[PDB]
Amino acid sequence: PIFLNVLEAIEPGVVCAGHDNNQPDSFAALLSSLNELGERQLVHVVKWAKALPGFRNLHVDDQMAVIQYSWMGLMVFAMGWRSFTNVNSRMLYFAPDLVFNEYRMHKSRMYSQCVRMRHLSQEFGWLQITPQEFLCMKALLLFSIIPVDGLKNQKFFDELRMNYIKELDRIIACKRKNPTSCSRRFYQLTKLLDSVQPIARELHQFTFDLLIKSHMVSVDFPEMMAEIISVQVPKILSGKVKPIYFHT
Numbered sequence: 001p002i003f004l005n006v007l008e009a010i011e012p013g014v015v016c017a018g019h020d021n022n023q024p025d026s027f028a029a030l031l032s033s034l035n036e037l038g039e040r041q042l043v044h045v046v047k048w049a050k051a052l053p054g055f056r057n058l059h060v061d062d063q064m065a066v067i068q069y070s071w072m073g074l075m076v077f078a079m080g081w082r083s084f085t086n087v088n089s090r091m092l093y094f095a096p097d098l099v100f101n102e103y104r105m106h107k108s109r110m111y112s113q114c115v116r117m118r119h120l121s122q123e124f125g126w127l128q129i130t131p132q133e134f135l136c137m138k139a140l141l142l143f144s145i146i147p148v149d150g151l152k153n154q155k156f157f158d159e160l161r162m163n164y165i166k167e168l169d170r171i172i173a174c175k176r177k178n179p180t181s182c183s184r185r186f187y188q189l190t191k192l193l194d195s196v197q198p199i200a201r202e203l204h205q206f207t208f209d210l211l212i213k214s215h216m217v218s219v220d221f222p223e224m225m226a227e228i229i230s231v232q233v234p235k236i237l238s239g240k241v242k243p244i245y246f247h248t
């Protein structure tokens with residue numbers, strides 16, 4: 001399982017948010033911590049992506065593009081997984097020092113979005129998702145959103161996406177027997193993958209509005225976060241860049 005060896009081998013390690021928990025919760029502090037966590041996580045996601053099989057085939061501008069458009073979903077999907085494995089989806093485990101309970105979900109002023117994310121975490125349990133299926137689905141998420149106008153070199157991207165989908169089928173096919181199970185399983189995983197986009201979309205809208213009024217609510221946005229959310233995210237919210245869905 002060469003391909004699986006790579007995903008397993010390059011999977012990012014634990015990342016902390018640097019949150020002061022001995023300090024009373026507040027909107028400004030929580031969101032500022034989540035943002036810092038984004039900056040820190042982005043760094044790992046970039047190093048992770050550049051190490052994926054065939055990623056370097058993509059044109060350099062397209063490499064940065066898919067990462068800049070997919071980080072939200074990637075991060076949310078991995079966050080859901082940690083929440084499932086660490087606390088069986090009891091809370092949102094953003095980081096070791098940033099675990100969201102119902103109080104924080106509410107205090108973050110993004111309770112509805114958090115509920116959305118916890119529900120995704122629950123799915124990992126309800127579908128009995130394997131660590132390997134998780135890994136393969138996550139890799140596939142990096143290639144699940146592109147500009148309606150296409151990429152610099154769409155042809156390579158298309159080839160790459162086709163291969164990662166082919167790998168997901170392999171994972172499903174192995175350790176299995178019933179051809180009806182393979183198809184059903186693929187149906188469920190693609191359904192799950194699609195369910196990530198609406199959550200990402202809601203978060204994009206939220207962080208965008210947050211960046212705009214950040215100065216008023218006293219929320220901090222690190223360099224890369226401020227740049228990406230003001231330059232790349234708007235392209236998604238305006239319909240110029242959209243998710244690739246399996247199902248209609």
Ligand SMILES: C[C@]12CCC(=O)C[C@@H]1CC[C@@H]1[C@@H]2CC[C@]2(C)[C@@H](O)CC[C@@H]12
Pocket residue numbers: 031034035036037038041072075076079093094095203206207210
């Ligand atoms: C991606 C992060 C940080 C990494 C993670 O574990 C998922 C989580 C989802 C909510 C995001 C947060 C980064 C900072 C954002 C974008 C805030 O501005 C509003 C929504 C937050």
Ligand SMILES: Cc1cc2ccccc2[nH]1
Pocket residue numbers: 042046063064065067068224228
């Ligand atoms: C490839 C790449 C993507 C990206 C996003 C934010 C900052 C730097 C980056 N390099």
Ligand SMILES: Cc1cc2ccccc2[nH]1
Pocket residue numbers: 003053054160163164167
């Ligand atoms: C996942 C993946 C398999 C593979 C084989 C050849 C070239 C690129 C590839 N990506």
